[PDB]
Design a protein around this ligand. Structure first.
Ligand SMILES: [Fe+3]
Ligand SMILES: [Fe+3]
Lengths: 320, 320
């Protein structure tokens, strides 16, 4: 079991050089005059100060009209499904990041995760503002609760939980790597059917207010992916005993599964009824994301057939 | 034992009205369209958006000079002791607030605590910036590590930990109320010898840069005290079985002890060698704070002899 560190360890190492992501021997004073993990402190500053944003300073005068009239029945169904799921995801994230933060022994990394946890809270605030602004009170509740109706949404949610619940029940080193990899996958993939969709509506001038909110959320998710990419790669070097062949295998499995499921969710939401998104065009996106993120944490591409981002336009569109 | 909630509960209550601070039955989706605890959501917005601040946007060109020359040997000793302790406190806070947040079943309250945890991270950043700006690299390390030299500081730290460690080891309902009350006390009292001191130097135009940083930190601590005052009072109404006479007694004890110790720390730091602070004038401050905060959580004044703030000038000086 990963023994959760005492609030203060007077027998703790003074040398910042002796810090470890996990299983270190810190004082648990945030001795930030010496930083071992420069990327953790930089990412704290970027998430906490540089990229700071206020969801209510984004004006939402247009979208309530476009929803009521201009949007098709299929476009409203998607909007509902995507926002319901992203509300689920960010909710799981604010809660699970408290688990990671309390197990990590490097103060600069703990700081980066506190900043991440806060950004996840701002997202929860952004979605509440989107629904308060765009739709009516009953519809807003319905969207928050759309897992209660839709089995493909409910199962999406129970699945993401299960992997996080393994670590909470059995807080061992194996279930920590799993939970960490799951966090990276959730941040890597599970936002991007949703992001691609909203950026599609925005390409033809639909829900450009919601899309503004999304650009800010998506800027945050890149930093989060960047934070956990560094954490996984640093855990490789510092704890190679934990990356057994059984784990190295399991990582490739879940990543392939996750790419598969995100694609299908992308298809169940759109269904070729959205002017810009094809059931095929979803694949080449999620497949390119999978390769990008799994190779970035030191693996072989899991879909070598794909070696090009189909939606390259996004990278310029998403920008602020 | 307070069973830490699963990541997702499909058997969770839909009705925001059924939420509890602890031992509720939530879905753990942040259903923020309905808010039971209006004060929690307001405080989130105030801490997260309204009161947002960047420590590095405060200029620190003056204090490095005033430290090197203008400051007495006693004034430098105090500066060192106070900052070392506040670094300890805010470090304990970022870590312990992850414990509270993961045990609380009301999403709006969990949100407020995430915002609090983030503000605690910004304080850790502020102190690192103060020491990077004001003093030299060896002195900066020495101040971070001044518990290693000074037994009155080391014991101050081990004591605050012990009460938080009780709950982490034995996460039962009794040790939760204790930890919660300890958090309120730490936020109520333990900052204010430090704040009074810095605001004293600032009254005679000493370390006005450090004092700017402190005003922002102190604005945050008022919201934190306000957040946990509401949490304790809501816990009284919702869980009166937990406020046994044994607990109601223990609360009055620790609060009197805490007022006593903060006063002494105030005296060990200053020692009547600081132009504005008397060993007596410390008492009437901490005694007035004690009464203010313990009555605000529904108790009888613990020092009826005192019924006036000696340093009323602070309330206008601390303002931004
Ligand atoms: Fe995220
Ligand atoms: Fe605080």
């Amino acid at each position: 079991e990963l023994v959760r560190k005492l609030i203060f360890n007077p027998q703790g190492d003074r040398e910042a050089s002796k810090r470890k992501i996990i299983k270190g021997n810190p004082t648990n004073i945030f001795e930030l005059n010496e930083i071992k993990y420069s990327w953790a402190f930089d990412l704290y500053k970027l998430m906490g100060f540089t990229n700071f944003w206020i969801p209510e300073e984004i004006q939402m005068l247009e979208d309530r009209k476009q929803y009521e009239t201009v949007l098709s029945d299929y476009e409203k169904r998607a909007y509902e499904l995507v926002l319901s799921f992203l509300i689920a995801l960010d909710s799981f994230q604010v809660d699970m990041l408290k688990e990671f933060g309390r197990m990590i022994t490097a103060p600069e990394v703990e700081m980066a995760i506190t900043a991440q946890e806060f950004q996840e809270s701002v997202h929860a605030y952004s979605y509440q503002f989107i629904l308060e602004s765009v739709v009516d009170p009953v519809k807003a509740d319905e969207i928050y609760n759309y897992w209660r109706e839709d089995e493909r949404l409910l199962e999406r949610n129970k699945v993401i939980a299960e992997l996080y619940n393994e670590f909470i029940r059995k807080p061992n080193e194996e279930n920590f790597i799993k939970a960490t990899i799951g966090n990276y996958i959730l941040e890597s993939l599970y936002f991007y059917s949703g992001f691609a969709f909203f950026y599609t509506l925005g390409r033809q001038g639909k829900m450009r207010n919601t899309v503004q909110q999304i650009k800010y959320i998506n800027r945050d998710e890149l930093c989060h992916v960047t934070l956990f990419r560094n954490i996984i790669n640093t855990l490789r070097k510092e704890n190679p005993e934990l990356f057994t062949p059984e784990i190295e295998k399991w990582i490739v499995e879940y990543f392939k599964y996750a790419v598969n499921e995100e694609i299908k969710w992308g298809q169940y939401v759109t269904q070729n009824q959205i002017l810009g998104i094809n059931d095929v065009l979803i694949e080449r996106y999620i497949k390119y994301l999978g390769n990008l993120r799994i190779t970035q944490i030191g693996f072989d591409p899991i879909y070598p057939e794909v070696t090009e981002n189909p939606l390259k336009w996004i990278d310029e569109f998403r920008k602020i």
